[PDB]
Amino acid sequence: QAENAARLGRQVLGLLPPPTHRVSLTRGPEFARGVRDLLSKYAASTRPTVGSLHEALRQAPFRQPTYGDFLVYSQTFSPQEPLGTFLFSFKQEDNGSSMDMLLTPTSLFMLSGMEAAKAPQTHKVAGVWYGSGSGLADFIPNLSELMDTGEFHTLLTPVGPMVQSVHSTFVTKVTSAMKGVGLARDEPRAHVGLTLPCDMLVDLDESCPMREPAGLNVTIYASLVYLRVNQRPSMALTFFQSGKGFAEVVAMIKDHFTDVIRTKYIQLRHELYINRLVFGAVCTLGTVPFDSHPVHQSLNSLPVLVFANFEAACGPWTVFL
């Protein structure tokens, strides 16, 4: 039965962080023979083989993100998932010991209270995930007044993708992922990418040839727009995707939310309230590799994007205007 544990001596002692390369001098000039991954250019030949480049792939860069273990009710967080969603962390007051509230983006549509045809796709789908948009509003009685002074964008710390969810009757364990590429669970060696609904994303890249250069980076953003509908406060959320640098996109987001600025600020001819003047915020949700194709999907229908090789990197809620 130690033949079981002899496998454990393999996997654990092989999967360790690399030690600090340190050599005492009485060995002599031997230290540089323990320098391997600093090389890059290996040995080509006439007909090379796995047996000729097994050394060339034995080295590997050291990458692992860290996770966030959460405890959720079975009411805020749906029992069904597509396993690759996006998250938040709502933050009001530490009542429970480990009692956390999370928000998927499909949930956060129903928390808002906006029009139907402004986001026509998920509204049919996000009505069967949850109730009439009031089962969650019972948890925060300030969702009218958090909208007034502009404090809701201050109380969201994004996390990124999912990794695993073991679900019970009332309590759901959520193993999330920050910082990078979460290793999957139900499929070993797989890597859980990020998934967005096709409704909520709005690209900034796409153009006709009319020319812009490539790179390594393209950055998913996260908008959050306080609007007012039917003389009642209600937020609005969109996404972005553009490898264009922070100085450009703020000058490009304002063209997308032009009319929303145009509708509201007509009303302030007769009144002014200094808490109302704040408009939106932009966070940075991390980086996407260049020219990785977002493969479309479908769920019961709901078109769902995917991003392979997403790595997570959060940021502050920088206000814009």
Binding site: G245, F246, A247, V250, N275, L277, V278, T318, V319, F320
Partner: peptide, 17 residues
């Protein structure tokens, strides 16, 4: 007042990048 003046000056980073 000063909380919003605190906020918009954070936004002026976006134009002097």
């Amino acid at each position: 007042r000063m909380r919003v003046m605190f906020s918009y000056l954070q936004s002026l980073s976006s134009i002097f990048n």
